[PDB]
Every structure is written in C-alpha cells, then in structure tokens.
Amino acid sequence: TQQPIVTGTSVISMKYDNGVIIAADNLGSYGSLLRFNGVERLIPVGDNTVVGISGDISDMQHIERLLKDLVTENAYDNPLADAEEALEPSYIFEYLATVMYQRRSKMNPLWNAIIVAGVQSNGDQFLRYVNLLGVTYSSPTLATGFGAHMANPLLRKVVDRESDIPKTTVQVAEEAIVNAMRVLYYRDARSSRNFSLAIIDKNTGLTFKKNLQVENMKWDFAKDIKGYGTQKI
Amino acid sequence: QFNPYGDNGGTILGIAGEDFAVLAGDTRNITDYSINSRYEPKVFDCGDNIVMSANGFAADGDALVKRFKNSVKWYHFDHNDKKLSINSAARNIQHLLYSRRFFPYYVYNIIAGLDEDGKGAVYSFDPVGSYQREQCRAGGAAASLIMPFLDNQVNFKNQYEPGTNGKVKKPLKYLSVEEVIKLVRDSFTSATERHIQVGDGLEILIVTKDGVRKEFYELKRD
Amino acid sequence: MDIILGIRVQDSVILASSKAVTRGISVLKDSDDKTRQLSPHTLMSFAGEAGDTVQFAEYIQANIQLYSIREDYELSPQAVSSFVRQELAKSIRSRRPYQVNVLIGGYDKKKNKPELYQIDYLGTKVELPYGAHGYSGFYTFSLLDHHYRPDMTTEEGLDLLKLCVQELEKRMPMDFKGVIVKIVDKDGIRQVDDF
Amino acid sequence: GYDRALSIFSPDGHIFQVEYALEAVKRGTCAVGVKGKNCVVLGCERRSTLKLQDTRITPSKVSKIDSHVVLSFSGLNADSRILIEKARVEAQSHRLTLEDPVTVEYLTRYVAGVQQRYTQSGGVRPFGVSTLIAGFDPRDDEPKLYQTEPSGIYSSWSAQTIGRNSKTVREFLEKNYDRKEPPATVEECVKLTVRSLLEVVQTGAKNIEITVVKPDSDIVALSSEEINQYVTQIEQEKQE
Amino acid sequence: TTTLAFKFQHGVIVAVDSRATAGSYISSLRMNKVIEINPYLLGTMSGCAADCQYWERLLAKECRLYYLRNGERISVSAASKLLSNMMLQYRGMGLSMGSMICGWDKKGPGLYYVDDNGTRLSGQMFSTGSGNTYAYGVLDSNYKWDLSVEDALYLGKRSILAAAHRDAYSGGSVNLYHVTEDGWIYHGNHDVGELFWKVKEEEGSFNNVIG
Amino acid sequence: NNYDGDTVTFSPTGRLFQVEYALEAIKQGSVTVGLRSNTHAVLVALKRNADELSSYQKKIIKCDEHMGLSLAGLAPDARVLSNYLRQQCNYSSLVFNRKLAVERAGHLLCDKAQKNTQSYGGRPYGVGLLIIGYDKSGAHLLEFQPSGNVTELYGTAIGARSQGAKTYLERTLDTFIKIDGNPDELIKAGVEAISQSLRDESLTVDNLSIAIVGKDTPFTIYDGEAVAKYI
Amino acid sequence: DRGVSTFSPEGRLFQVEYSLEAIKLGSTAIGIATKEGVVLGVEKRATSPLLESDSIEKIVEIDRHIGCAMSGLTADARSMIEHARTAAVTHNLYYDEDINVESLTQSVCDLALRFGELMSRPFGVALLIAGHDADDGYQLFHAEPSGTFYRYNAKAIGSGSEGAQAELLNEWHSSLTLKEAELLVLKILKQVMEEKLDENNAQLSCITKQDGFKIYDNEKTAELIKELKEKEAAE
Amino acid sequence: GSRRYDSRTTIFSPEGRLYQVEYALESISHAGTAIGIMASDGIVLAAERKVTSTLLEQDTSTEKLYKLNDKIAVAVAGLTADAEILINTARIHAQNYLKTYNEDIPVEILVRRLSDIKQGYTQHGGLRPFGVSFIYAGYDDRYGYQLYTSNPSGNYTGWKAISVGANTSAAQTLLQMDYKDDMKVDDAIELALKTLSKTTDSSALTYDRLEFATIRKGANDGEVYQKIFKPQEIKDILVKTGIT
Numbered sequence A: 001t002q003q004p005i006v007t008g009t010s011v012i013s014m015k016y017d018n019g020v021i022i023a024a025d026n027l028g029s030y031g032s033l034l035r036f037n038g039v040e041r042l043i044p045v046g047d048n049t050v051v052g053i054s055g056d057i058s059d060m061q062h063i064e065r066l067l068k069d070l071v072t073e074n075a076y077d078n079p080l081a082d083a084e085e086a087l088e089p090s091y092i093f094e095y096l097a098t099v100m101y102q103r104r105s106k107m108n109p110l111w112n113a114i115i116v117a118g119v120q121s122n123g124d125q126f127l128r129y130v131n132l133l134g135v136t137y138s139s140p141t142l143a144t145g146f147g148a149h150m151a152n153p154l155l156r157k158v159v160d161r162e163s164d165i166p167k168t169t170v171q172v173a174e175e176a177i178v179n180a181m182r183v184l185y186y187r188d189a190r191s192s193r194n195f196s197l198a199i200i201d202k203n204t205g206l207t208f209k210k211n212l213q214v215e216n217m218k219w220d221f222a223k224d225i226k227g228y229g230t231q232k233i
Numbered sequence B: 001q002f003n004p005y006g007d008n009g010g011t012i013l014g015i016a017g018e019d020f021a022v023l024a025g026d027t028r029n030i031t032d033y034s035i036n037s038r039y040e041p042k043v044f045d046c047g048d049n050i051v052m053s054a055n056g057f058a059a060d061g062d063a064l065v066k067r068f069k070n071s072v073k074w075y076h077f078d079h080n081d082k083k084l085s086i087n088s089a090a091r092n093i094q095h096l097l098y099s100r101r102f103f104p105y106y107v108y109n110i111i112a113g114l115d116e117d118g119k120g121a122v123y124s125f126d127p128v129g130s131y132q133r134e135q136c137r138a139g140g141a142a143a144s145l146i147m148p149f150l151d152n153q154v155n156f157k158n159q160y161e162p163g164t165n166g167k168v169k170k171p172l173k174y175l176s177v178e179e180v181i182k183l184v185r186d187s188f189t190s191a192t193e194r195h196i197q198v199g200d201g202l203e204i205l206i207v208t209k210d211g212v213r214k215e216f217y218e219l220k221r222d
Numbered sequence C: 001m002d003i004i005l006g007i008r009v010q011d012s013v014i015l016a017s018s019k020a021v022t023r024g025i026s027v028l029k030d031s032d033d034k035t036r037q038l039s040p041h042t043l044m045s046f047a048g049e050a051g052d053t054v055q056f057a058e059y060i061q062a063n064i065q066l067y068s069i070r071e072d073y074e075l076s077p078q079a080v081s082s083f084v085r086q087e088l089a090k091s092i093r094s095r096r097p098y099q100v101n102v103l104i105g106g107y108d109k110k111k112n113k114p115e116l117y118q119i120d121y122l123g124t125k126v127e128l129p130y131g132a133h134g135y136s137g138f139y140t141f142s143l144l145d146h147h148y149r150p151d152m153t154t155e156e157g158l159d160l161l162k163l164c165v166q167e168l169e170k171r172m173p174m175d176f177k178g179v180i181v182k183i184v185d186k187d188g189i190r191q192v193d194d195f
Numbered sequence D: 001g002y003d004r005a006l007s008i009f010s011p012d013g014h015i016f017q018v019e020y021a022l023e024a025v026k027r028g029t030c031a032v033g034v035k036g037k038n039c040v041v042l043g044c045e046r047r048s049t050l051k052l053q054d055t056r057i058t059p060s061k062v063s064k065i066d067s068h069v070v071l072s073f074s075g076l077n078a079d080s081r082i083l084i085e086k087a088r089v090e091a092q093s094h095r096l097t098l099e100d101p102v103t104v105e106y107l108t109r110y111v112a113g114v115q116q117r118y119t120q121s122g123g124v125r126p127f128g129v130s131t132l133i134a135g136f137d138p139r140d141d142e143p144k145l146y147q148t149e150p151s152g153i154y155s156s157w158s159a160q161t162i163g164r165n166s167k168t169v170r171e172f173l174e175k176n177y178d179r180k181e182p183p184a185t186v187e188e189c190v191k192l193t194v195r196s197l198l199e200v201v202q203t204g205a206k207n208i209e210i211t212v213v214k215p216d217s218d219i220v221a222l223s224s225e226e227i228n229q230y231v232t233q234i235e236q237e238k239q240e
Numbered sequence E: 001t002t003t004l005a006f007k008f009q010h011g012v013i014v015a016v017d018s019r020a021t022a023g024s025y026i027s028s029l030r031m032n033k034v035i036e037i038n039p040y041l042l043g044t045m046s047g048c049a050a051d052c053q054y055w056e057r058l059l060a061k062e063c064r065l066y067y068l069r070n071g072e073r074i075s076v077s078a079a080s081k082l083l084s085n086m087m088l089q090y091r092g093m094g095l096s097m098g099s100m101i102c103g104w105d106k107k108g109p110g111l112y113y114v115d116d117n118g119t120r121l122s123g124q125m126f127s128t129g130s131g132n133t134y135a136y137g138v139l140d141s142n143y144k145w146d147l148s149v150e151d152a153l154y155l156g157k158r159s160i161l162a163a164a165h166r167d168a169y170s171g172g173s174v175n176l177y178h179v180t181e182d183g184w185i186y187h188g189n190h191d192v193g194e195l196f197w198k199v200k201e202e203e204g205s206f207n208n209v210i211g
Numbered sequence F: 001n002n003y004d005g006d007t008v009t010f011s012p013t014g015r016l017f018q019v020e021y022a023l024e025a026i027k028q029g030s031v032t033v034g035l036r037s038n039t040h041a042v043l044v045a046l047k048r049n050a051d052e053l054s055s056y057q058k059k060i061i062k063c064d065e066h067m068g069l070s071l072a073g074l075a076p077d078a079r080v081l082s083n084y085l086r087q088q089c090n091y092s093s094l095v096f097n098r099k100l101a102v103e104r105a106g107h108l109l110c111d112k113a114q115k116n117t118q119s120y121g122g123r124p125y126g127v128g129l130l131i132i133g134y135d136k137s138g139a140h141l142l143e144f145q146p147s148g149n150v151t152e153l154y155g156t157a158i159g160a161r162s163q164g165a166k167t168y169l170e171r172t173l174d175t176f177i178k179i180d181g182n183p184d185e186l187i188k189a190g191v192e193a194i195s196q197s198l199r200d201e202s203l204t205v206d207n208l209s210i211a212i213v214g215k216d217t218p219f220t221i222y223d224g225e226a227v228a229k230y231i
Numbered sequence G: 001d002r003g004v005s006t007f008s009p010e011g012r013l014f015q016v017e018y019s020l021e022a023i024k025l026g027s028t029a030i031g032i033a034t035k036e037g038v039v040l041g042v043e044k045r046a047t048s049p050l051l052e053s054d055s056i057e058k059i060v061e062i063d064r065h066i067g068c069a070m071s072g073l074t075a076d077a078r079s080m081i082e083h084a085r086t087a088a089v090t091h092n093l094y095y096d097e098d099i100n101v102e103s104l105t106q107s108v109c110d111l112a113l114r115f116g117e118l119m120s121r122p123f124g125v126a127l128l129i130a131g132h133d134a135d136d137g138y139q140l141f142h143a144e145p146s147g148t149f150y151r152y153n154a155k156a157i158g159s160g161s162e163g164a165q166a167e168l169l170n171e172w173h174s175s176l177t178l179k180e181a182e183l184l185v186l187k188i189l190k191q192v193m194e195e196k197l198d199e200n201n202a203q204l205s206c207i208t209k210q211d212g213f214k215i216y217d218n219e220k221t222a223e224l225i226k227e228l229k230e231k232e233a234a235e
Numbered sequence H: 001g002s003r004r005y006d007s008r009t010t011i012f013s014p015e016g017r018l019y020q021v022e023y024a025l026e027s028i029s030h031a032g033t034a035i036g037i038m039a040s041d042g043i044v045l046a047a048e049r050k051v052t053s054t055l056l057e058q059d060t061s062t063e064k065l066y067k068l069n070d071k072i073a074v075a076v077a078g079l080t081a082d083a084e085i086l087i088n089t090a091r092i093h094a095q096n097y098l099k100t101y102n103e104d105i106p107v108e109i110l111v112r113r114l115s116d117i118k119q120g121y122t123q124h125g126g127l128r129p130f131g132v133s134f135i136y137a138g139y140d141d142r143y144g145y146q147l148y149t150s151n152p153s154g155n156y157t158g159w160k161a162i163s164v165g166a167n168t169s170a171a172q173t174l175l176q177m178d179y180k181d182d183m184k185v186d187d188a189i190e191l192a193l194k195t196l197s198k199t200t201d202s203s204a205l206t207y208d209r210l211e212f213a214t215i216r217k218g219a220n221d222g223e224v225y226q227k228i229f230k231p232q233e234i235k236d237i238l239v240k241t242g243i244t
C-alpha cells in the first residue's frame, strides 16, 4: 500500500475507421504544484502499439522499463521478431493486465490507469483499459481520470456505438480528440497546455506527434464578468 | 489506504428449463456514476456445454472465469477427454472460490447447462464458495428487483386458481424457451428503468443438447 | 467457562466446577464436566475461552500419559503443575496465547499429602489450601478464610464447599447450573454423584 | 543434508541392507509370543554372559506401548528404543485425535510403516529389529499377536518366535501348539511359553523373562520364583 | 437459520429450515442445510454457508478415508472431533460455523455439537442458529425419551415452525431426517407457508394469527 | 567405461556416455514418423503391446489446441516433458494471450533437458520426441533428443528401424511438401513412410496411431476404427 | 559406488530393472477382465502354519469401484495404496464423481520414478489395479515400478507369471462369464502354486458395477474350489 | 561427484554388525581403564589416567571423571574431546528437566537421552560415531544408587559393578569374584583400587596416574554428596588400602 506522489492526469483515446488515436498531456504534478513540464506519458511499443499511462509517474517509469525489456525478450531466438512473431497490442495489454492484477493481489499496486491503443496483425483496431485494481474494459472511446467525465461524452457524440467506427475518418477523430484536450485544459486544474498525440493506422502506420498545444481558446467573455452577484463596476 | 476491491455493477440471470437453460446478463460496465463500456461481455461459453458469469468486481470475475476455463482444459488432459458434467464443474468452482476464503473473489457466480439426464440446470454461488442447484436465480445489482418477479411468474408463488379462493394453487406447468426469453427480456427492461447500473445491452446464452446459442437485445442507454 | 473451585483438606483435594456451557444467549448444556484426569492421583479442572480450554487440557493429559508409559511411573502433583505452568508461560508470548486458567488437585503418594495448585493463563502458579479463578474467589474466599482448618475431614470439606456454592448461587447474577464435585485422595479420583 | 541411498536393489533383486538387518535380528536374544484362549504371553531370553547386572534398573525386554498393548523385540537394543518411543507417541496421538485407544493391528501397522520408511529413505539405514506386538483391543476379549521385521512386512500369529535359535523354538511350537484347542488357561499358556524357551535358553534361572497380558489392560510381569516353579515342574515331568 | 437435533428411544431426529439471507434480503427460499456424510452420518449447517459446506464435505472425505483404512465405519465421536480439530487450525481467522454431527454407531445413537471456536459437546438435544431459542421452547416442554417415531418427527417439524414464524431470518421450508441403526431416512421437504396453516387448524395453536 | 558412472563426467574423447545411453533407449523404442506440408503437419506412430491380452501403449500426446508430440523411449519421461510443454503453452496464453510458437517450444525443451546433463545426482531424459504444430508462421515439425538438441525439419522418424522411413521421406521430400489443403493425402504419405520401417508385423486397427494439426484443424488424435480408413 | 538414477549401456535404468527381479520372487497374483466384471486372485504363501493366514492382506480396496492386488515386496505397496485411496477420494471431493480407473492408475504410476539422491529407491512391488467406470467399463491395469502401466484383458504377476500368462493366452476370450473367470483364476493359481491350493492359502475377489469391490469369504471360495475339482474330473 | 569419497559410516556388515561402532569399541579398548562399583550406602568411581608425564599439572587436570549435576557423575573411556561434547549436552538436559518439572532428573532418563544421541549417529547423518564409553554413577529417590554404562552403539545397561576401557575382561572377572551384595563404600573403594592395581599395564599404581570419586549418602542427614578426590587424597587412600 502506498500513495501516489508525482502524477499524470487524463489519457484519452478513440477508435476510427482505419485505426486508433490516443493522447495525453506532458505534465507531472506534485500535488497542487505543477512541478514537471516535459513528461512523455505516451510510450510506443514497436510500430503498432502505443501505451498511454496516467497516475503515479515513478510506477509509469517502471512500466516503461518492463515494456522496453519485453521487446528485447521477444527478439531473443526469434527470426520473425520484426514480422509474424512481433509483439501485438493484445499481447502487450494482457501482460500489463496480468502484472496489474498480481500487484493489487499482493496489496502493493502500481498506482496507474493504462490505455493500450494499437492495430493488430489482421488490421483490427485494439483499444483496452486497465488500472491499479486489475479492472479491464474495452469501448469505442476510452479515457482515464477527468477524461472519463469530460472527454468520453464528447468522443461518444462521434462514435456512440460500434457501427459508427467505419463512418468516422481520421480527420474527424483527431479533431474530436484535440477539442477534448482543450476542454480538459479549461476545466482540469491538474492539466497542461502542452500535449502529445499518437495515431496508429493500419495503412499509414504509427504517427507520433510531440509538442502540440491547445489553441483557439475562448477567454474574451471574461472582461464582461464582474463581481459575484450585485457588483456592477 | 489502498482498497483492493471495486464494484463494476451489472446484473445476471439464470433460468433452468425442462431440456434447456439460459444465462443472461447486461453488457454495461461502470465505476461509481460513470460508464466504462456499453458493451463488455459478461457471460462466457466455457466449453463442455457450460456457460458462466461472475458478477461483481470485474477483475476477480475475469480471473475466476479464466481459472475455470483452465480447469476444464486440464480436466480433459488428466481424464482422457472426459466431458465435465455441470455438477462436477459446480463442485470444482466451490474449491476455486474457497482457496481465497481469506481474500475472496468479490463475485456472485452462476453457471448453466444440462445435467447428465439432459435436463436444464443452473448452479449459483456466493463469493466464498457456497453453492447449490437452482431453477431460477438473479444475481448482481438488480437481483432484489428481479427475483420476486421470477418467484411469481416462473414458480407461480401466491397465485391460486380462480373460484377456489386460495384453496387450490396454480399448477406448476413447464415453460418453453420462447416463454423464458420473454420473462428474461421483461426482467431486464424493468431493471433498466429503476436501476442506474443496468442498461445499454442484454446478451443471452441459451444451452441445449445441440450446443450454445447467443441472442442480443438493446437496452436503454441513459 | 466460569466457576471452578478447589479445597485441600487433611487427606484429600476436592474440586468443584460448574456445569453450564453458553453460546450466544442460549445455555447449550447443563451437565458439562470441566475436568481431565492427568494421572490416577492427579486431576485438573479448567476455565477460560471457548475451545481453547479442552484443547489445552487434552494436550496436557496426553503429555502426562506419555510420561507415565515411558517411565512406568506417576509424576508428582508438583512436577505436573510445573510442567503445566511452563506450557502456559510459553503460551502467553506466542502469536495466539491459550486463554486457560486451571486448578490442579493431586495426592502425592510419596509424601502422603494432598496438594492443590492454582495456575492462571499467564503461568502464575501458587500452592494453596483453597483456590478459585475469575470472580469465584470474590464471593467465596471470605467464607473459606473463616471456616477453613487444615485438619478438616473430606465430609467437612464438602459441607464448607456447599456453603460456598450457596453463596455463589445467591450473590452472582450468573446461573452456572450447579457444580460437579470430584475428590482426589490416596485411593484415586472419584465423583460425588449427589450434590 | 545427508541424502545417500544406502538401501538399494542388487542385480539379483535383493536389498542387502534390509537382509543384513535381518542378520542383526538373528544375533539378538530369543523372544517368543504365545496366545491362549483368553490371554497372550510374551517370553524373552536374557543372555547370562552378563552377570553383576542390576536387574532393577536394566531396560526390560518387554515394553508397554499403552496400558493395553505391549512390545518385545529381537536385534539391536538401541534401535528398538526409537521404534518404542515413536509407537508410544502415536498411541497417545491416536487417543487425542480419535478418542479411542489404538487397536493392536493399527499400532503394528504404524511400527511396520516406520520400519518400511527406513528402507527407502535417503541417508538412513534400516532398523536391525524385529518386534512382537501383543495385546487386546478396547472392549474386546479376543487375543492379538503380531510380528514385524526390518523390511516392513507384518502379520498375525497364533504363536511366533524371533531372534537367535528361533528356528529351533518355532520347530517346537509348530508340533506342540494346537489351533483347534489353544492354551485354555494362563497356566497352560505360560507353561508352553517356558517349555519353548527351555529348548534354547541354557539355564532356567534368571535367563527367562515372562510377561502375561490379559484383557481390559491387565498386564503383569512374573518374578524369578514364579518362573522357577514352572521350570521345576517341566523337568520333573520330563524325567519319565 | 434454525436447526435442531435430538436423541430418543428410536434414534435421532434432525430438522432444519431452508432460508438464506444476505442482510435483510432473502437470497434463498430453499437451501439444503443438512449434509449426508454417509448412510449413518448427518451434519447440520448454521453460520457462513460456504464454511459449512466446505469443511463438512471435507469431513466426509476424511470419514470415507477412515472406512478404507480400517474397513469399518467411523464413530460419531471421532467424526465430530476431526471437524473440531479443523476449526482449531483456523483459530481466530474468522470462520463462522455451527453444526451438529448426528448418527448411529456401536455405542448407539450419537449427537455432537461443534462450532468455529472448536467447542465439541455431546448431548441429547441441540439447536443452533438465530431461531434456536424459539425451537428450544417447544422441544423442552414436549420432549421425552419414550417418543414414537411419528410424534418425534412432528416435534422437530413443529419446533422449526415455531422459529420460522417468529424469527425473521428463519423460514422457507422444513427438511426432516430420521437416523436409525440401518441408516438415515429422509422425511421430505415441507413448505412453512402451507405447514403453518395446516398446523394452526389441526393443532389449534397460533390463535393470535388470523386465517 | 570408467567415465559412464554419471552425467557429470566427460570421457577422454569429450563424450558424455550417460547421454549416449539415454539416446540408446530411444532406438529400442517403437517407430514414429513425423512430416508436414505448408498447410498441415502429421504424426504417425506404431504403437507397441506387451502381449495379446495387453493394450497398445499410447505414443501421441496433446499439448495444446495447436501443438502436440509423439514419443519414443521411456514413456514416463515423455509425460514429464509433455506436462512441461502443456504448462508453457498455457503460461503464454494466460499471460500474453499468445499461442506459443513451435520454435520457442523447442528452445524450452532443449533448455530443460540440458540442465539434467550438467548436474550431479540427476539423469538425462530417456525419450525422444517429435513435436508438430501450427502457429503464426505456418506448419512446423521438430525433433527432440534428450542430449538437448532440437531440430526443425520437413519430415523425420525416430525409434527402432527408423532409418527406412527417414530415407523414404528424403526421396519424397519434393512431393509431400506440396500436399496443401489435403489432410488425407498427407496422412497417406506418413502411413506409407512408417510402412518402410515394418518387419514381420503389419499395420492393424489397434496398432496404428495418427495425429494431425493444420490451418483450420485443431490437434486431434485418431485411434481405433478411425484409422481403418488409412490401413 | 554408482548413481541410483544411472542408465545402463543398453538404455535401461539399473535400479528399475533390479526391482523387477524382486517382483519375480513375489507370490503369484492373477487378474482376469470380463464384461460381467473383473476377477482378482492371489497366492497368500504363509511362511509357517502358525501364521494366521487371514491376516495376509494382498488384495486391497482402493475405492468402491476400484480394487487392487499386489506382488513382490508387499510392504512397499502400503504407501502406494494410501496415495491411491487419497487420490480417489480427493477427486470425489473436487468433482463430485467417481474417478476413472486409468486416471487412478496414472496417479499411482507418477510416484514410481520419483526416486534419486524424494525416496531413495524405486518400489519393489507390482500392482494389478482392477475397476469399473461409466466411460471405459470394466478395466484391468498392470502398474510397474518403471512408471509404465499397460491395460490387460488378463494378466499374471509374480513367481509363476510366465507360466500363468501362457495359460491365460489360451483360455481367455471376450465372452467369458464371471463364474468362468473365477474358476479360471483358481485353476491357474493351483497350477503354479507350490503348496496345494485351498481356501486358506489362496484368496479371490471381484469388482462389479452393482455390488462394487468385494473380497470373497473363505466359505465362498471353498465352494468354487470344490466346483473346480468336479468339473476337471468330469472329463 | 561427492559419492566417490563417502565411507558410509551407518551401514550393516554382511554379518549384521555396524562397522564403525565395532571399530569405535576397538578404539575404546586401548583407553585407560575406568571402574564403577555400587554399594548399599554409596557408589565408587575409579579411573586410570593414560601414560602421564611428571610435567603434567595434575591438580587442575580432568580427563576421566566429570560432574553432570549434583547427583550424577560419569567416568570416561575413549576420546576425551568427543566425551566433552556429550557431557555438555547431558548437563543441559539435566537443567532442562529441572526447569520443566522442578525436580532433579532421574538417572536413567539422563542416561537414555545420551544413549539415544549416540544411537542417532549409527543410523543416520553419515557421520562417524562418538568414540566414547561412559560409566554413569548417580542417585535419585526412586531407585536410589545406580550404575549404568553406555557405548558408541547407544545401548545402555545397569550394573552392580562394571569396568570400561582396557582390560575389561580381566577386570570384570576380578570384580565378579570379590563383589558381594551387602558390601559397603569403604570396601568398594578397596575393591576398585585393587582391581586397577592388578589389571594396569603400568609397572606400579601411583596417585598421579589415578582419578577417583565417590557418591555417598555420607552427607549430613538425608542428602547426597559428590566427592571428586584431590591428588593428595588419592595418595592417602592408596596408603590406607595398602597398595603403596
């Protein structure tokens, strides 16, 4: 049993017609202190998977190393390591889910919420969630922390059910994700303007975008707001 | 302090027919007031004509089902591909649950299938491993909403024959698979109305001598 | 369990033990014998937490019986009491201590003397002319202090014991369902069937 | 730990260490067991090479395992103490867990099992001991007499002998003991047990020990004078 | 729950209810609270259902192994002791079990009470569970050694009924058993709803209740 | 001679005699044949009986839905090694949701057998195995020797008189590799291959044992009247 | 000296081969499987007339549906029987059913090769395990210390085994009745035994679906011996 | 591996003897003779030190006679170092018994415990046995005065008079001849010294070549006293009995 110290906030994601998108901001909070501003919380595994992690950063760095070691171990005595016997998103997720549930069963959890986004060998989209309790679930949209409360409602307006996935393009999906990140910056006190976004497509592969910023923000209406009720000046 | 348990909501229902059995459950997965998934399968085909659902804390539910599926696999290896009977599966599951008597699987488990005489069978379990064979059983969040309705409409409790005025009971006539599915759908539609954790979708697994069939129905998404 | 008494007279030791066993708000039994014969001339009564009492008593019984067979010889009441004390003193610092209080009544055939030992669950041993455990002594010791002589007969010891039980029955809020009385002397152990 | 396999098979299918343990039994003093109609008698040889012995304190050949069961032996003396101790512990352990004293058959099966375990465990040698176990089951008046040996096999006997010159006394028992009509009284049973030992013992003085076991935990050891009277009566009838 | 068991001239009666609760919710209307360990041995269940089923089914394993090793049926005294020793291993670990081991052996009919604390008591009459006080009331006033098999079965049945009526956590149905020297005999499942109205009319009892 | 008392001792020419003696146990064992195409992989095994009253010792063991083997030598050692494979196949599924690659299965068997050849007290395994399977890289056939050596092959045979079947497969190499999408013809080639190792005795209904795995075919064993088709 | 788990140049485990020689010295045990049941019979072989022959227990119950006969160093069988009984009842605990005869036999044979430098040597006893289950019906198995077990229609183990097995070769057919099998075991036992066969120095037993495993009384076997003598004198 | 170098200390010979026990007894037969004689009013322990030197400090030396507790003592024959291992174990066992039962340990119980330890080394562990034979002299209120002996086999027996070490055959014959049941301590002292004086391999028996001890009820009233004799006291008793 512990408590989280340095933390990362929401990770958001969604499926679209040819793949998946995942995003997360670059902040490492120390309670209310916005301590670290250059933290990457999306960690690619090969060219077909991106693991997005929220929660305790020290445990994230531990998980990051497990995945790096997993790639190394898979290549051992494996001539098809960069082909048929390469790591799949489902393999990577189930490994993490096994670790998370074992750790909670020893009353010593990895204090995280994880989303594994990727594309399988047969072109199928993969998107599944796992957390410190070992709880797992899948959905057309997935989000952690505040993202679950604010991002999912926006992303579910694009992909409300399974049948909406083939109708959703990468431009529309990316637009929805970017809008959600702006809304989180407005309303999540433990978020930052700077974020990273990753697209895993079955045709164009893995596109990893760094140093993105929330833009087109509405603040002008603030000038007119005065007092808390009766004040006019 | 770290709390190793959680509540993923959901509700399940098992009904045993004369020569069939059904195991139904909603597809909604939740934490607190949020929806995790509108479609997260909860009832599984475990092989040997047995269906299973572990309702409550999803992590423990997935672990138990995974271990039972494994137990079926090793039962084939160790005993010359012998079919695991529903009563044998039930007793095996008791020992899986009680192996964690002091750190329980937080789930209410139900299995369904056919007994060795070909008749419909449902077995129900508590988190620590008490089990028993039943005709009708609802489990999970809206279990208290559904069970009384099944006592009334499946076993004809408090129902008597007109004219006699309480002297002669309503006779216990058997129900068809079409009749049972109607009672299942109405049970979940009613549970969806009055329970916030129930909704999105309903998945039913029907077991007969021919095998395991699936049926899916939409539920209210609010 | 509750009340266990003991008195050492001229030529014998008398042990009185309640018959009641309670579980929840219901008296499950009113004829329970809270005692074990450790050897032909040594008797141990016991009282404490449910389950622990009998388990401890039978464990002691087994050890003394094992000793008797091995050496073809009966241990003195003093030797048995010391063995019992050590087991309790060992127990009190264990992960889960045995919450058992005992009286050991024995007749030493070598010295031709009756002996009564009082041992609590901590391993606190004392040799006494009369003894009790729990609240039993609060009601009875004033009577024993007054009436007790060391040259008393077994019959006089029983009469003084009746007076102690009568006082308990009057002033205790607890119904302990009477007592089973046993006498330990040179001829061995016998039960007083009418009391 | 020392794990060396000492008891192993040989090309001809023999476990020599178990067979050499039987040779140690052959060297041991003679022990005999005879069961009558309502009793069992255990006779034991005491070699008279050892005089100036203190017979009060010297370990007796017959040992009580419980109040209703006894055990005598032939072979290594030190080895027998280990079996006796284990048997005594098991007897109390059985009373404690099952609330009945051991049957003679159960106690025998346990002791035989200990002997067997020492024939296929690493780092240990077999017991150089064969035992005769006798007594009466609780609330039963049928006499019981069993034999065990280093290999771990056991069986019930109407009458049996073990130890040195056991071949001779067994020869005597086979022709003298009638199954249809066993020794009806204690006297007849003791007399037959003493007679059988007199074939081998040498002198009938302090060389013969007798222990009578009757039903309901009635076990007594005969004294020198009591045994000497049997020795006197036997030889006086023989002079004819 | 409510369970009872008593010895008498013609063996031992065993009667239990069939209700199971999870708080104030009635989780089960008909649960078997008796376990058949062997043709001459029964076991009642009160407390945690899981603990009762697991340990008593494990006792049956150990009682069965006794028969194979010794070629003879285990005594009621020995069976009850094995169970109490199991409870003593998990001492203070939180088990909740209250059972009566009922049977017939060489000493005649046998009845032992055993609970999670390790307590093991021999006796003629016992009753366990939340409704045991109501059952004892009827038993104590009507029990005799000279009871007929028919009257004895009714007493145990009527005693459970008394408890099922008053105790909120007891009810459903009554399961009866009769233990003889030829083994135990099941005397059926009796719904309390129907049994109550029947007893009321025939016996004249429960006058305060309207029907 | 002086260097064959245990597995921990090299001979002066660098040989391990206990391993070579374990290899000898395989040669005494009954013949079994393995072969594959691009779509399917087949095991064929000649079962051996004690006498006419006895049953015919089983030769083929299933490890997973997509993998299994045939044995030749000490049967109990095959049970130990197959049990290990069952666990490893199962560990891969439960932890990684991944079917175990046949090549990796061979590497695991090699390493398990090796430990028994370098340590004092233990002994080498006295059995040879032919592992077949279908994974993400298609059909596979492996030959396991208790020395630790594992080899991936198109076809092979082990056991008594196995040289005859091995020569046949070496001639037929170009033919049977091309038998794609035809399980019955691939089995025929295996039955014809194992027939080259027979003397005196012939293939009867309770003598022959066949197993197959492929693209849309789980590992299944055929015995009794199920193999009468191929006699 | 040499390792306990050592291979011979021929590819056999020395100790396993030597334990088989010990089994050849053991008393004869015969098993015959039919469609009406499986019969098990043994030679008691008392070393002396004072030895109470009824205490010789070479036929043993494992479960109600499984029996067992032994030959060789019979003391080694006790731990095997204990394991078998535990395995049989434990499976009944876990799965609420009878255990398959083959599965029970496999569990016993798993102990066999658990020896090294675990127990210090292999078992010096062979077992004939007979039983019945719903899947494969009436079965007879021969469990060796090698860890190998063969199923048999009929089998003899012990000192007169090869002579008895040759006799079982000719006599056994698939339409044998239970009564015919009983007389056949008695016939072959009488042939290979040193002493004259009677109810006191030989024992019969059987396993049927209805009545389960039963050891025959000496009075019941005596009649079957008398029935055998008359039918042999009939031609 | 290691098997090559294992002597196998715990095995039977073809004749059914324990090799190492027999060879240990052969070792003990070369050790200095120790004698024990039990009388009605006490026990005597007499023992011969092996070929000593004039420069050996005798008054502070102890190689034969050791004290286990106030009631029990032992005479040693064999390897002294081996004996001290066992002696310290026996001293601990006596104190364990006293702590448990609050009574002095009965002689036989202490003897059985040590003999069981010796037995263990002959049956398991693969270690050499202890090359030691003890004579136990002790008193308790059950059997009174008692003499026991134990040897490397772990077998123990009770005696009225007994010898261990060298020339036991000759010594036992002499003891068997002159011993009587109504004998007293002062007479037993004389018998012990006379027996050593005739069996000794030395030219003459002197004070510097002896260790001596008595266990007497010759203590003020109902109690027992152990007396380990000093060099000057051994010299006096040698003159008194008429040996020097």
Ligand SMILES: *[C@@](C)(CO)[C@](*)(O)[C@H](Cc1ccccc1)NC(=O)[C@H](Cc1ccc(OC)cc1)NC(=O)[C@@H](C)NC(=O)C1=CC2=CCC=CC2=C1C
Pocket (backbone or CB within 6 Å): B124, B125, B126, B130, B131, B132, E001, E002, E019, E020, E021, E022, E027, E028, E031, E032, E033, E045, E046, E047, E048, E049, E050, E052, E096, E129, E130, E169, E170
């Ligand atoms: C009275 C009902 C007490 O109120 C009885 O004592 C009864 C005994 C009993 C019932 C069934 C089988 C054997 C014995 N006791 C209970 O039912 C018991 C009371 C209880 C609850 C909790 C604890 O601490 C853990 C101790 C005692 N109730 C249960 O065990 C409850 C938990 N059972 C269930 O909730 C339950 C739900 C369920 C669903 C499907 C199948 C079985 C189910 C059970 C047993």
Ligand SMILES: [Mg+2]
Pocket (backbone or CB within 6 Å): B191, B192, B193, B194, B195, B196, B197, B198, B199, B220, B222
């Ligand atoms: Mg709803």
